[PDB]
């Protein structure tokens, strides 16, 4: 649980 996000794609 909890997805890492490099902020490259939205939503």
């Amino acid at each position: 649980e909890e997805e890492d996000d490099d902020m490259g794609f939205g939503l």
Epitope: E1, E2, E3, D4, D5, D6, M7, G8, F9, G10
Partner: antibody, heavy 115, light 113 residues
């Protein structure tokens, strides 16, 4: 250190099938969305497919050019990302990169679609 | 699909001099959450691409301050204050605001000598 190693590239006949693998290490594979990006020889980059992590129920996305022919999948227990390609066309010839989000890129594996 | 247009196709710059490259979208990249998902990547010869900038203007870690990203809506720009030998390569813009995630055609930066 972060490492992504793609395996499986090779020569295949038009209409043929091929499965690519990507082995991930040095980061938390199971909490990351992964992508496949390809580049035809001497051409630009083209996004192919995306798979989210287990928290987002492994949602999948595909470019129109590969939708229904390609299947993106993962094996979290083995830190593996896959790309199954069916009914291959000469336009599918490219270097295929495994990508963590938009930031960590593998060295790529070459797929040559030819008679 | 959102069409990403990069100009110029190629440029030739002397080491120490500035460079400026453009990325224009067929529709606004301002997303529903008020953020603009515009990324800039560099692919050096015989190497894999690497991300330099995200969210129009944010620098990834280890990217020198010589790079600046700017713009809004449909018009975006990457600027290099003083080019170094290591900046040689092809620069791509990649939008993540609208599905499918489309790339610009690339701008090849060459070293003038």
């Amino acid at each position: 250190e972060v490492q992504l190693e793609e395996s499986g590239g090779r020569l295949v006949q038009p209409k043929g099938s091929l499965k690519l693998s990507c082995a991930a290490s040095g980061f938390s594979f199971n909490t990351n969305a992964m992508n496949w990006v390809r580049q035809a020889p001497g051409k630009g980059l083209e996004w192919v497919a995306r798979i989210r992590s287990k928290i987002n129920n492994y949602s999948t996305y595909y470019a129109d050019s590969v939708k229904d022919r390609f299947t993106i999948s993962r094996d979290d227990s083995q830190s593996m990302l896959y790309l199954q390609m069916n009914n291959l066309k000469t336009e599918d010839t490219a270097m295929y990169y495994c990508v963590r989000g938009t930031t960590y890129w593998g060295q790529g594996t070459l797929v040559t679609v030819s008679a | 699909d959102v069409v990403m247009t990069q100009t110029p196709l190629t440029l030739s710059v002397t080491i120490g001099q500035p460079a400026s490259i453009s990325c224009k979208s067929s529709q606004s990249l301002l997303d529903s959450d008020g953020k603009t998902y515009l990324n800039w990547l560099l692919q050096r010869p015989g190497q894999s691409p690497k991300r330099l900038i995200y969210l129009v203007s944010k620098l990834d870690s280890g990217v020198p301050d010589r790079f600046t990203g700017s713009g809004s809506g449909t018009d975006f720009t990457l600027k290099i204050s003083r080019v170094e030998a290591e900046d040689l390569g092809v620069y791509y813009c990649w939008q993540g605001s609208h599905f499918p995630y489309t790339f610009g055609g690339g701008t090849k930066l060459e070293i003038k000598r």
